[PDB]
Curated annotation (Swiss-Prot):
This is Galectin-16. Binds lactose with high affinity. Strong inducer of T-cell apoptosis. Predominantly and highly expressed in the placenta where it is localized mainly in the syncytiotrophoblast and in the endothelia of fetal vessels. Also detected in the amnion and chorionic trophoblasts in fetal membranes. Keywords: Apoptosis, Lectin. The gene is LGALS16. It comes from Homo sapiens (Human). The lineage of its organism: Eukaryota, Metazoa, Chordata, Craniata, Vertebrata. It comes from the Eukaryota.
Length: 140
């Protein structure tokens, strides 16, 4: 089946216990830009609040933040970058009471404490030059 077209947008409803699962492959083909970006918006509009932002800079860092009232807030940086140019990845973002649990390829890498209640998220966008296999939201 074909890769999803990027930028890829998905309307969503998140609650405690929801799990966002993103599968794809990153390419080392950008210059001064991340190779993957994930944004959780509070409206189906790119000017709305970003409750959760993640971007991947291969070989350098994974960056997480929020954009509240138009402003990028406290940046949280990881120098553990479990993504590899040309290799497939499994990115899982699990909504807990107090944080998102960020998981890559079966490794628990970061807990991002909620700044906006995740019940306010309405749209996920996945973009940059990722070859995107699937994006889904599950719960039980
Ligand atoms: O905080 C996420 C936010 O970062 C912006 O870029 C930052 C960059 O991460 C930092 O290393 C640099 O020192 O400052 C920049 C602020 O302009 C991105 O532009 C933005 O899209 C988010 O990714």
């Amino acid at each position: 089946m074909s890769f999803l077209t990027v930028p890829y947008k998905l309307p969503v409803s998140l609650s405690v216990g929801s799990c966002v699962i993103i599968k794809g492959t990153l390419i080392d083909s950008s210059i001064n830009e991340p190779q993957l970006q994930v944004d959780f918006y509070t409206e189906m509009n790119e000017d709305s609040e970003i409750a959760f932002h993640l971007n991947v800079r291969l070989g350098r860092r994974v960056v997480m933040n929020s954009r509240e009232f138009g402003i990028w807030m406290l940046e949280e940086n990881l120098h553990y970058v479990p993504f590899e140019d040309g290799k497939p990845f499994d990115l899982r973002i699990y909504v807990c009471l107090n944080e998102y649990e960020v998981k890559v390829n079966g490794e628990y890498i970061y807990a991002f404490v909620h700044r906006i209640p995740p019940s306010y998220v309405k749209m996920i966008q996945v973009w940059r030059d990722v070859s995107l296999d699937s994006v889904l939201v599950n719960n039980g």
